[PDB]
Symmetry: C2
Subunit: 267 residues, 2 copies
């Protein structure tokens, strides 16, 4: 097996592969082992863990050596970029599969994490056992963009939740509530709210029994004013309130919160 | 049996009234318009003719209003009747408003307790929900059993603002999370992934408890080592999220606002630090 890209994810992936008995070949620009991107010729599938797909085009003028190779791109980027990368690779005679690794670096050895895969079905199966060294696998289809669609959707919720968490902690600190005291309350049931919200969105109808945008908007005003009074930055909660206001402007006052999705949807 | 009075009959008040009736309390209510109370009167509630009369009924006084300013208006005729009463204000507002409301009430000889009810209306009465309380300790104890009819209780201290601090902190995370969830769903719909398919992944994909604990610990510490995860990478990750949304034609205001915080981190020189260090950009002076 060969691996290019030695950020934290790549180092962790390399270590798991070594510990599992694979004959690993790596190339990196830094000193920190193949002499050139040579690495493609080592014979294994080629794992990429780069910051973006644009890096793949730079790092690789070895395009002739792609013929007959299998590229497993485990770095994240847009679905469009992933589809373009696949087409480029296949144009030089390689097979291509996209991975969306749903774990931080320290989780890479573990049993509790998974990764999405999509692209070349045969190439995925040939390397499934190798990929299971890193995380459990979940192949979604032959469209090389699809694993990235899933990945980016989940990361969207993730980062929005985490920045909200930080803001909540900033309010706690500003109001004299210790981080150790508030943390268990922040941690402890979103599953229930998610399920009901998904159901309502699936339906098409957003009845205002259970919650109403006019009251939700007032609730969010109090959050923002509480942050202001405490002297904490209010950009994030204002952006959240901004969606509610848009709902009100659209005439949604008596509808449930879920109807706001129609303000975010594509045409 | 035991008497209780309630003012404010929006959804939350209506739910609270029903629970109290079902638990055998002698309830008295007052409202600006007579219609919303006839319903509870049919179920055995006394309806008072004025706010003053409602205060006199003899129980603790529960408030479930839209904001604390409303308390000053509806009780305008009735300040003299506050002497010796206990106010349990279960409506949400700012900590500063809650402190002011308590001081005013105490100035007219009442005791005051603040509630932050962590349940939607339909959950009132259930076993799985709780509420924060703060303010007058004795008054909380005297009415604890009554309050446990509505939700489990969690008394935090004598500062009448404190329960609202907790409440607002939690709602801050709650709404930010929920709007993110909606945005995620919009991307799913735009990209042709069915809501039923993506939903279990959104619910189960990342165990947030673990990330929260580690983030809190790091913030408690005071430094933010990038030796496993770093703001330059986190920023790039967020760029891909926003570009994915753009490509799909979905509204991008929310993910931009999230990205904006990472860019501020970069501008401040935080590229090599962990994500938690962004808290110092949000902190009070």
């Amino acid at each position: 097996v060969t691996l290019i890209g030695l950020g934290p994810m790549g180092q962790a992936m390399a270590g798991a592969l070594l510990e599992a008995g694979y004959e690993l070949t790596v190339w990196n620009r830094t000193k920190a082992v193949a002499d050139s991107p040579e690495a493609l010729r080592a014979g294994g599938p080629v794992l990429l863990s780069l910051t973006e797909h644009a890096v793949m085009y730079r790092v690789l003028g070895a395009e002739s050596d792609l013929k007959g190779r299998t590229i497993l791109n485990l770095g994240s980027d847009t679905p469009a970029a992933s589809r373009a990368a696949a087409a480029w690779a296949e144009g030089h005679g390689a097979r291509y599969v996209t991975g969306g690794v749903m774990s931080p670096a320290p989780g890479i050895g573990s049993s509790s994490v998974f990764s999405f895969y999509s692209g070349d079905r045969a190439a995925f199966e040939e390397n499934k056992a190798l990929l299971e060294v890193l995380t459990a696998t979940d192949f979604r289809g032959e469209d090389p963009g699809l694993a990235q669609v899933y990945y980016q959707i989940l990361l969207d919720l993730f980062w929005t939740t985490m920045t909200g968490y930080l803001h909540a902690l900033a309010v706690a600190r500003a109001e004299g509530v210790p981080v150790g005291t508030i943390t268990p309350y922040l941690i402890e049931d979103m599953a229930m709210f998610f399920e009901g919200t998904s159901a309502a969105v699936a339906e098409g109808r957003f009845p205002g029994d259970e919650d109403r945008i006019s009251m939700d908007a007032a609730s969010m005003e109090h959050v923002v004013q509480t942050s202001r009074d405490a002297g904490v930055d209010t950009a994030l909660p204002e952006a959240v309130l901004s969606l509610f206001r848009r709902g009100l402007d659209a005439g949604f006052a008596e509808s449930s919160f879920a109807r706001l999705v129609t303000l975010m949807d594509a045409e």
